[PDB]
From a paper:
NDM-1 has been reported to be a highly potent carbapenem-hydrolyzing, zinc-dependent MBL. NDM-1 is an extended spectrum zinc dependent β-lactamase capable of hydrolyzing nearly all classes of β-lactams, impairing the ability to treat life-threatening infections with intravenously and orally available carbapenems.. NDM-1 resembles the common β-lactamase fold, although it shows low sequence similarity to β-lactamases deposited in PDB (20–33% sequence identity). Our results show that NDM-1 is unique among other MBLs due to its enlarged and flexible active site, and explain the observed extended spectrum β-lactamase activity.
Numbering used by the authors: 45 to 270
Write the structure that this text describes.
């Protein structure tokens, strides 16, 4: 039911879900997402690589929490974050993604979410496109690792999730630059830091949670791209 995945409590109301890619050509690549308990409900950030693993996420919530799952947000269109979209849809869960991510989805061989988020000129999601997100604060830093990458803070916790935008403080490099925007990358990573200026824990797309140092390390590496 929920065997393959790893679930790690990061705060009383917040857990990290981790799933591993099984595909020929690849190592077992970790992908992280978040489960957030808000009062009498649960919110999910990102799926797992596959429908099956994503369903395991829902089974864990059922067994370990036993509150209904209100909504899911995906932070960019890639298999690792979007892979299980139809598992969410099949469970009757409302899904949200940046409009651009929904547009990119089919190009990526992935299913789009049900609703498109839009963003104000200052980078903050428009509350009309993100009803009842509660503690979830959603920000679009501008183009970075990808053009569609979005970021989320969790109110009352001091954790923020950069998605693919922020690399670990130990990272040798910025990783896959295929979708990257060379000139705006540094500015985007710094905008993220200023958007969640109080967050002491930055959740990573692949490795373990890091500190604000990751943000600085990333921006400085991106400074050399230009």
């Amino acid at each position: 039911r929920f065997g393959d995945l790893v679930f790690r409590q990061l705060a009383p109301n917040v857990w990290q879900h981790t799933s591993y890619l099984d595909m020929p050509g690849f190592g077992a690549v970790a992908s992280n997402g978040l489960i957030v308990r808000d009062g009498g409900r649960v919110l999910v950030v990102d799926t797992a690589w596959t429908d099956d693993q994503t369903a395991q996420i829902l089974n864990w919530i059922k067994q370990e929490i036993n509150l209904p799952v209100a909504l899911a947000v995906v932070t960019h269109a890639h298999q690792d974050k979007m892979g299980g979209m139809d598992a969410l849809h099949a469970a009757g869960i409302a899904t949200y993604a940046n409009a651009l991510s929904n547009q990119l989805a089919p190009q990526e061989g992935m299913v789009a979410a049900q609703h498109s988020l839009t963003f104000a000129a200052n980078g903050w999601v428009e509350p009309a496109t993100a009803p009842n997100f509660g503690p979830l604060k959603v920000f679009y830093p501008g183009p970075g690792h990808t053009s569609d990458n979005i970021t989320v803070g969790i109110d009352g916790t001091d954790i923020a999730f950069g998605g693919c935008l922020i690399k670990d403080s130990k990272a040798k490099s910025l990783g896959n630059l295929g979708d990257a925007d060379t000139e705006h990358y540094a500015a985007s990573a710094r905008a993220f830091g200023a958007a969640f200026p109080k967050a002491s824990m930055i959740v990573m797309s692949h490795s373990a949670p890091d500190s604000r140092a990751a943000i600085t390390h990333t921006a400085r590496m991106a400074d050399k791209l230009r």
